[PDB]
Design a protein around this ligand. Structure first.
Ligand code: PLM
Length: 158
C-alpha cells in the first residue's frame, strides 16, 4: 500500500488495514442480502450526542460518544435490512487511528479494546465471506500469515 479509496470485494484471509484521518464513516460494506456494515471514527472527548452519518447513501442518526480524553474511538455498526436500525459493536480506543478488518472462516475479525493493548475478536452472527468494502480512506493489505504485523500497526502505528 497505500491503496487509494475504492470499492472492492476483498479476499478471505486478508487483513485490510485502514488509515483514516477524519471522524465519520471510514469504511462500509455489504453482501446485499442480510448485512450492511460500517466502522465509524469519533474524535477524542465527545460526550453523548446524536450524530448524522451518510451510510450507504442514507442520512442516519446514531447516538454516539467517546469518553476518552486522549484517544480516538472506532465503533462498528450493523443493520440487517435496507431499512433496518443500526446497532453498535466492538469499540476500539486508538492512538494510531488505524483499524483492521478480515473476512475468514465466515467470520469478520477486528481489533478491540484500547491501544497499545488492543486484541483481535470477531463477529459470527452470519457468514460474512462475501461482504464487499467501500473504503473512504487509504488502506493496506496484510495476509493472515503476517497478522502479527497487523496487530503491531494497530497498537503502535506504521
Ligand atoms: C472486509 C469487510 C469490510 C466490511 C466493512 C465494515 C468493517 C467493520 C465490520 C463491522 C461488523 C459489524 C458487526 C456485526 C455484528 C453482527 O451482526 O454479528
Amino acid at each position: 500500500g497505500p491503496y487509494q479509496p475504492t470499492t472492492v470485494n476483498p479476499p478471505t484471509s486478508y487483513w485490510i488495514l485502514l488509515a483514516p484521518t477524519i471522524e465519520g464513516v471510514i469504511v462500509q460494506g455489504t453482501n446485499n442480502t442480510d448485512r450492511w456494515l460500517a466502522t465509524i471514527l469519533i474524535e477524542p472527548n465527545v460526550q453523548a450526542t446524536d450524530r448524522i452519518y451518510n451510510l450507504f447513501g442514507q442520512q442516519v442518526t446514531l447516538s454516539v460518544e467517546n469518553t476518552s480524553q486522549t484517544q480516538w474511538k472506532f465503533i462498528d455498526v450493523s443493520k440487517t435490512t435496507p431499512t433496518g436500525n443500526y446497532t453498535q459493536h466492538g469499540p476500539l480506543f486508538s492512538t494510531p487511528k488505524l483499524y483492521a478488518v478480515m473476512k475468514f472462516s465466515g467470520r469478520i475479525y477486528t481489533y478491540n479494546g484500547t491501544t497499545p493493548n488492543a486484541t483481535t475478536g470477531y463477529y459470527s452472527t452470519t457468514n460474512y465471506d462475501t461482504v464487499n468494502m467501500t473504503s473512504f480512506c487509504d488502506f493496506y493489505l496484510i495476509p493472515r500469515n503476517q497478522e502479527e504485523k497487523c496487530a503491531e500497526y494497530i497498537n503502535h502505528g506504521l
